[PDB]
Structure formats: structure tokens, C-alpha cells
Structure 1
Amino acid sequence: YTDWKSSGALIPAIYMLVFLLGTTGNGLVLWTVFRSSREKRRSADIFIASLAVADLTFVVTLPLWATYTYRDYDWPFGTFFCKLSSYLIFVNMYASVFCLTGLSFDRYLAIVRPVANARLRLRVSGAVATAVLWVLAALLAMPVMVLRTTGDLENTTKVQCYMDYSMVATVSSEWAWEVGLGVSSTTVGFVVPFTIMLTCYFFIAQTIAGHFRKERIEGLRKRRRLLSIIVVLVVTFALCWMPYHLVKTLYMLGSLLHWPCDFDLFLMNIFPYCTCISYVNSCLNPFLYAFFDPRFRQACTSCTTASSSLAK
């Protein structure tokens, strides 16, 4: 396909910029989590810690792909590192969305339904949630580790790291496997987690509005601010993760929908911009989830009853 001349030079620079911003911000947030270490606040601090780890490891393997795009798509490193970098990228994609969804669910449980939040053992349930979250992310990204290799064709001899679905009866299933794995990923990493997060946040918005129904003139301003943070969180998630999954599903649909190949060219050369848009949320998250929660900011920065006489 006719890859854009502009893309080859644009993608590496923004990739480096995202690497720097995301890695330094996630370093700062994990530094906060380590330095505080009071075992005092943020009963669900482990969710933000897991999200920070996922985000940092999501941007850490980025420079290899920055070179890949700067190397005119010629992977220099080994087959093992193509496998590991892709597996880390996908595990971290899934764990980032999962941690965002689980944190939204924790906030929902601890706001709209605070009775159960106070009742139940929060810390152990959160720890088990993180454990199963990471195990499920690893098991969901396992296929992109077992089905990824290097070296395709062409007298250029340019080593290309790609998902070679041809390992499993390629002639019997090539588009079948492409569409199946793509749909499974985009429907068990985005559609389900995203709808869970959106419903949690919708109920949260309703109940915060109800709680600040009257309060006071200051109170309704705080309601405005809280609704603002909710909208900005959900909409930054939306803006970041819609281009990627949208073009990905459009491409998977073009297989059985005789997409206009000419416009399929456009889809192909717009996808990398969608992946950096996905990375935008990874870069920006530490400046919202930690910044707007001033626990991180602080970490970085009457008388008495009496008796007398009942003289008859």
C-alpha cells in the first residue's frame, strides 16, 4: 500500500514525545505511590498503581517501534523482542482499559452505593481484582505473543515484525483468524470494559447531581466541577480509544464488506495516527488521576459533658 511520505517522519517524533511524557509522568506517579507508602489513604490505591505500571510499560517498549517506523519498517531486533514488545503493548492496552474500568467501578461502589462499600472488605477485594485483572490481560494478549514473528518476503530483505496468523491452518483460515482475533480483542478489551465504565459513571453522575440537589451555592458549584471531571475523564477516554478501535473494526469489516480499496488505503495510513491517539490517554492520565486527586499533590508537595444538681 502507498504509505504516506509524511507519516514515516511524523510518527517517530511523536512516538519519542509520547515516550518522554508518559514515561516521566508515570515515573512521577509511581514515585508518589512508593514515597507515600503510609497504608493510610486511597483504599483502592492499588488500582491506580496498576494503571500507572501498565501505562509506563505501555510507553516503555515504544522506542523500539519508533525505530521500526524510522527504519522504513525493518525490525532490527530479534524475534523474541518483537514477540515481547507486542505482548507488552497489548497486555498494557488491556490492563490500562481494565484498570480504568475497575477504578470507575470502585468509585461507583464507593459513591452511589456507599453502604456496601463500607460493609465489604475493600482492600482484599481490590487486591483480588487486580490479580485477576492482570491474569486475564495476560491470557487475552497471549495469542499476540504466540502468533507474532519476523521476516516476510521481498528482495529488500527488510525484517518485518507482524502477527503471522498463518501458523494455524493458514489456507483454511486467514481472514477468519484475522477477524476472529481482532473482534475478540476489541470486544473483550474495549466494548465490555467501556460499557461497564460508562454505566458506572452515568450512575455516579446521576447520584452526585441528586446529592448536590440543594446543598448550597458553593455546593452546586462543586457539583459543576464534579460533573466536569466526570465528563472530561469519560470523553478523554472516548477520544483516545475511539479512533483505534473504530478504524480497526472498519478494517476487519472491509474483509467481508468489499470496502473501497482506495479508501482502505486511507484506513491503512490513518491507523498509526489512531495508535498515537490511543497513546495520548496513556501520556495524559497521570496529570488527571493523580493531579485532580490532591493526595498525590500532598505526597509530592472543645469542652466536655458534665453533671450537676437537680435540686428539688
Structure 2
Amino acid sequence: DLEDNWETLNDNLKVIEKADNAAQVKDALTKMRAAALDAQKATPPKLEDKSPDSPEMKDFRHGFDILVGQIDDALKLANEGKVKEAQAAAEQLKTTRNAYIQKYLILNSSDCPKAGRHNYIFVMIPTLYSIIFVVGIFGNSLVVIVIYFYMKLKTVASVFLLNLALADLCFLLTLPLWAVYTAMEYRWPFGNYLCKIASASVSFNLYASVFLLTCLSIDRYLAIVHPMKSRLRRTMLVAKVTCIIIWLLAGLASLPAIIHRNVFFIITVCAFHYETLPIGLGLTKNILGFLFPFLIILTSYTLIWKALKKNDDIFKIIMAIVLFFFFSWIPHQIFTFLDVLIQLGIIRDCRIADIVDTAMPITICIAYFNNCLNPLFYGFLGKKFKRYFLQLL
């Protein structure tokens, strides 16, 4: 970690600034020397897709070579006995330190700064996120118990309904991180590792859900419209493998968040770094993660609802999770496209930019509100579940 070695340099400089003898300066500069050596092996936050041979990365590596040199002169002075002089040469780290934050950490976008930074958002969103997390954690963990004991994982539908609980449960585990981020007025105090994992976990939830909701739709279509000899041993085998592949595809689809997300200054923010290219990539996610599956899902359900309006309790559950999921993503879908128009230069108006940046935290809340609401859609099984509960004990 570059951020870790960067803290190793700043804290060891404070040791040198208060050091009395040369032995205190020697041991501090030795730790700093090894720190800048493996930090040279690393890649800065703004050069995520730059070959370790490009003039950009070479300028990064050369930067720490000068830093090693400044430390090497200070070590030479400490070995001679000069403490007051070794401390002066160590203070040259602050130049390289301020040169690194201005080159790779300051991401000044300006144009419409402090947009969507209203007093009610920093209070409304963390209070709403507290509820989604707490309600959803107890909700989905009860769903996992119900699937293992009431459903006993005997159907194909049961397997996908369990995986959706785990996927929803995973996203929920990262929710208090995004709650305090908003409460601290978009200040990220968890570093670079959690900025990447917490952003990839939000991305992963969308893809895995969309993939599971497609699988459950096809399952409902084939169960109701085209029934065939149920070879459970083979159907359970294919359903178990399909879910592994889903977690793999959603993992691979959320890889950009692990690559281009970093912590940057303006107050630190956990944001995506843009290299023309996002236009031809933002069009690829819509035609795969919303237009293509919702097309497959609707075709399955238009055929199944028609053949059932005159397994069904499960269909009600799968239909309610599918209908709510897509009607909650529409607000965010409109404003995400509108945010793209701000980032390009089509709509260059801070009055409009504010309306979009004040609504996006509210729209991303509703588009992820299903993780706490999905367990509540199991109420269709309530009359049959109380029948099992009483018969048990």
C-alpha cells in the first residue's frame, strides 16, 4: 500500500524533528529508506491504466529516487555525527510530499463546486441508511434461516432466492461506511483499500441481483409455461454452478471500481478517476445491465402471468422483487444520464448541476432500498409458514 508507506514517511519525519542524538535520526531514516523503495514499486492513484514503462510512471519512480537521494545525504550526515544538519536535509521530504499530493491526489474538477451540498442531505441520507442496514440485516438473515428450514433447498428457485439474500446481505455490510461518508459531508476516513472494496460492493449488488432476477424469471417461465421431467439431481447441480458463475460475472463486472476508485483531495473524497472513453463504456452498461435482462425478464413474466392469472406463492415473491427492483432504479437512471451531460459539457449550468447533485444521493438510496425491502416480500408465504411453525413446536 502506497498510502501506508506515505504515512510511514510523515510520522518518521516528526521523530527526526524531535530527535536529540544521531542514533535517533539514523533508525528513523533507515525505516524511511525501505518505505520509499517499495513505494517506487507501487502505482499512484491517477495512473491506474499506465504501463510501468510510460513516461508518467517513470516520472513517478524518478520522484522517489530524488527522495532516496535526499535521505542518503541525511544518513551520510548522521553517520558523521552531525544531527542539526541531518535534520535539515530530512526536511526536504516535505517538498516531495507536497509535490506528490499536487500531482496524484488533488483532483480539482471545479466549474460547479459545492454542488448538491445542502444541509438536509448530510442528515437525511445517514438516518435512512441506518434503517436500511438494521432492518435489512435482520430481514435477510431470517430469509436464509427460512430457506434452509422451511424450503430446505429442494427447488431451483430456493437456491437463487438464497443467493439474492447473501448478495443483499453483502451490500448491507458496507452501508454504514457510505452513511458516515455522507454524514461527514462527503469525507472518506477509511483510506484507499476500503474506498475500492466499498465502491465495488455497491457495483456488485446491481450486477448479481440483475443476474439472479433473470435466472429466477427463466425458472418461473420454464416451470409454468413448459413443464418437463424434473431431474432434480441435475437441475440442482446446474443451479449451484450458475450461481458461482453469477458471483464471478458480477465480480468481473465490478472490476473498474477496484481499478479507477481512489481517495482524492479538493476534505478527502472516495471518487472514480476518468482518463471520449466513458461515452462508449456508459452505453455498454445500459445495454447489458438494464436493457438486455429487463427484456428477458418481461418476456418470461408476460408468458407466465398469462398462463397463471386463472410455485405461485414463489412466483408472487419473484414478481414483487422484480417489479420493485426496476421501478426503484428509474429515478437514478434519469439523473445518472443527466450527470453524464454535466461531465461532458452539454449542460453547463450550476443551477441545473445543483438539482442533479442534490437528487442523486436520494435516487441511489431508492435504487438500493430493495436490500432491506426484499425480505418483507416473503409475506406471501406467511399463511403457509404459520401452518408449518405450529405443526413443528
Question: Shorter-normalised TM-score: what interval?
Answer: 0.7 to 0.9
CA contact (8 A) 1:22 1:283 kept: yes
Contact 1:61 1:85 in 2 (8 A): yes
1:55 is displaced (CA, Å) by 0.5
The higher-RCO structure (CA 8 Å, 6+ apart) is: 1
| CA radius of gyration, larger in | 2
What is the percentage of aligned positions where both structures have the same residue?
Answer: 34
Q: Residue 109 of structure 1 contacts residue 116 of structure 1 at CA under 8 Å; is this kept in 2?
A: no
Aligned pairs, how many?
Answer: 273
**Structure 1 residue aligned with 2:128:** 14
> Structure 2-normalised TM-score?
0.63
Q: 1:226 to 1:60 in 2, by over 3 A?
A: closer
Paired with 2:375 and 2:366, the residues of 1 have a C-alpha distance of 16
**Residue correspondence of structure 1 range 73-222 to structure 2 within 5 A:** 73-115=186-228, 121-153=234-266, 158-165=267-274, 170=275, 176-209=276-309, 212=310
Structure 1: stretches of 5+ with no match in the other structure: 171-175, 213-222, 302-312
Counterpart of 2:24 in structure 1 is none
Structure 1 residue 253: deviation in Å?
4.2
CA distance in 2: counterparts of 1:118 and 1:14, whole angstroms: 45
Amino acid at match of 2:119: K
Between the aligned partners of 1:129 and 1:300, the Cα distance in structure 2 is 32
The CA deviation at 1:287 is 1.4
Answer yes or no: is 1:249 the counterpart of 2:337: yes
* Contact 1:68 1:74 (8 Å CA) reproduced: yes
Say if 1:97 and 1:189, in contact at 8 Å, map to a contact too: yes
Cα distance between partner residues in 2 of 1:297 and 1:246: 42
CA RMSD of aligned residues (A): 2.8
CA distance in 1, matches of 2:373, 2:176: 18
Seen in structure 2, the aligned counterparts of structure 1 residues 47 and 235 have a Cα distance that, compared at 3 Å, is closer
Secondary structure at the aligned position of 1:3 is classed as coil
* 1:233 CA drift (Å): 4.5
Conserved 8 A contact 1:183-1:249: no
Q: Which of 123, 139, 159 is the aligned partner of 1:46?
A: 159
1:77 CA displacement: 0.5
Q: Sort the Cα spacing of 1:86 and 1:296 in 2 relative to 1 into closer, same or farther, 3 A.
A: farther
Q: Does the CA contact (< 8 Å) of 1:186 and 1:245 recur in 2?
A: no
Q: Is the 8 A contact 1:140 1:185 kept in 2?
A: no
Residue 179 (structure 1) shift: 3.1
